[PDB]
Amino acid sequence: MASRILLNNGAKMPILGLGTWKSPPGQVTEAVKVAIDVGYRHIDCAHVYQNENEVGVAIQEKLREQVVKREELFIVSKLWCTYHEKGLVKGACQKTLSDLKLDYLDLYLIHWPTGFKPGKEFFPLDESGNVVPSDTNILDTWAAMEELVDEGLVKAIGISNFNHLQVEMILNKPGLKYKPAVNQIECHPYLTQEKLIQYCQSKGIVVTAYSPLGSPDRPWAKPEDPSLLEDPRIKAIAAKHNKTTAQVLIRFPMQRNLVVIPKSVTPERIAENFKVFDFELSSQDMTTLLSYNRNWRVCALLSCTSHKDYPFHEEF
Numbered sequence: 001m002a003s004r005i006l007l008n009n010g011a012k013m014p015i016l017g018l019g020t021w022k023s024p025p026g027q028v029t030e031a032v033k034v035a036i037d038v039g040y041r042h043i044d045c046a047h048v049y050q051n052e053n054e055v056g057v058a059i060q061e062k063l064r065e066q067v068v069k070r071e072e073l074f075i076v077s078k079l080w081c082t083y084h085e086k087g088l089v090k091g092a093c094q095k096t097l098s099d100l101k102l103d104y105l106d107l108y109l110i111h112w113p114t115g116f117k118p119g120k121e122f123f124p125l126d127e128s129g130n131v132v133p134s135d136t137n138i139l140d141t142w143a144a145m146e147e148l149v150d151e152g153l154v155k156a157i158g159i160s161n162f163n164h165l166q167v168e169m170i171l172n173k174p175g176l177k178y179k180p181a182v183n184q185i186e187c188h189p190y191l192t193q194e195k196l197i198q199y200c201q202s203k204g205i206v207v208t209a210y211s212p213l214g215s216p217d218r219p220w221a222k223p224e225d226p227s228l229l230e231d232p233r234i235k236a237i238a239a240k241h242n243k244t245t246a247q248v249l250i251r252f253p254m255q256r257n258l259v260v261i262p263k264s265v266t267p268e269r270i271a272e273n274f275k276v277f278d279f280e281l282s283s284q285d286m287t288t289l290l291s292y293n294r295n296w297r298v299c300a301l302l303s304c305t306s307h308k309d310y311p312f313h314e315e316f
């Protein structure tokens with residue numbers, strides 16, 4: 001397959017990136033070094049993941065080593081919910097830049113549509129356990145993102161975990177200056193997202209699929225939960241193609257014209273997950289994988305469900 005997708009800001013984005021949520025800080029520097037050595041050119045980061053400094057050590061070493069040029073990397077980070085304040089967005093972006101050892105990001109996303117009360121805590125709670133909102137809305141936060149483009153800190157801006165009506169709100173913003181380039185959402189065979197994906201694609205937004213393996217290391221996993229990697233129907237498609245189940249799960253979103261960001265800290269898996277450019281799933285394989293949808297989400301959070309902008313009350 002072509003390795004990059006054209007964004008609506010005119011830049012090209014690698015369709016396969018390395019995820020970094022849950023990558024331990026004592027392992028992620030090596031993971032990113034290995035990833036760059038075996039061909040990855042896109043790293044998905046976030047301030048809330050608490051490991052950007054260590055990701056940055058790897059990026060900087062590989063730039064210094066001249067393994068890669070900065071222009072050939074596509075580095076993504078995300079604005080956390082406690083920084084949806086006009087006066088806090090720039091500093092949040094600059095902290096991420098300083099940690100990652102960069103003078104610009106290729107793409108900066110609003111991590112979740114919901115703003116939370118600023119402060120040290122990433123999830124400020126009231127005494128009954130509900131998150132404490134911010135009064136600032138997705139339109140004013142978007143304007144703040146647009147300023148980052150105009151100041152040279154980021155090349156593209158986008159959104160993450162925005163539902164259909166939230167994307168529409170952004171697109172219908174009075175005075176909109178830059179459209180979102182990307183909406184990064186959970187997507188895999190058990191949460192296939194056809195509705196939201198068609199809406200976004202019809203508007204020229206590129207969709208990035210997160211948790212493409214079903215996030216088996218999510219901290220709230222339960223025994224018994226469905227498991228993509230162990231689903232014998234997916235295993236059978238993989239065997240037919242002489243590939244691993246993970247490789248099928250990565251190739252699947254690629255053939256939907258999505259970007260995909262599997263996470264690993266295991267060097268052999270980092271390499272395995274990149275070897276997805278030399279086979280094709282058939283249309284029948286694709287439709288069969290889509291048939292496994294069950295509307296199952298890795299990423300949801302009860303403490304945030306009353307926030308007025310919590311995204312998963314809407315159907316899509």
Ligand SMILES: NC(=O)C1=CN([C@@H]2O[C@H](COP(=O)(O)OP(=O)(O)OC[C@H]3O[C@@H](n4cnc5c(N)ncnc54)[C@H](OP(=O)(O)O)[C@@H]3O)[C@@H](O)[C@H]2O)C=CC1
Nearest residue numbers: 019020021210211212213214215217246262263264265266
């Ligand atoms: N925007 C948002 O709100 C969100 C963004 N994301 C982004 O998406 C990335 C990917 O999603 P994530 O939730 O981390 O989960 P993934 O679906 O990428 O699954 C990661 C898990 O799969 C394991 N794994 C990786 N490759 C293989 C393989 N070849 N065989 C078997 N097991 C494998 C990893 O193990 P190991 O590491 O031990 O090798 C890890 O336990 C995140 O890291 C983050 O960058 C994710 C959630 C939300």
Ligand SMILES: O=C(O)COc1cc(F)ccc1C(=S)NCc1ccc(Br)cc1F
Nearest residue numbers: 021046048049050112114299300301304310
């Ligand atoms: O969020 C990630 O990238 C990966 O997940 C996380 C990553 C972190 F470093 C810390 C918390 C989360 C959680 S608990 N995320 C879910 C979540 C957060 C906020 C809102 Br609004 C809803 C929601 F569902």
